Write a protein that binds this ligand. Sequence first.
Ligand code: SF4
Ligand code: SF4
Length: 81
Amino acid sequence: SLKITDDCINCDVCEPECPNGAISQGEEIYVIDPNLCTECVGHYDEPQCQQVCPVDCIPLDDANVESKDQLMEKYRKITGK
Ligand code: SF4
Ligand code: SF4
């Protein structure tokens, strides 16, 4: 999964970009739900949130390291596809 760091400026532009609805506004910064973040695999070749973030604060989550096979399995479960 990806995660949103403390550098987030609460600009909102990533939230509508997520195909799985994984992003929401938290108490201090935006937050990714790791159960819905596929790192966009199955939808886009690259994470869509990273492409619009103005401060590049959406890195890989070190606490949630996943393979392409794992992410694609998550995509199938979320989408039924
Ligand atoms: S990487 Fe893709 S699935 Fe994960 S939060 Fe960003 S837009 Fe959503
Ligand atoms: S696009 Fe980047 S700075 Fe803007 S709300 Fe999302 S994570 Fe925060």
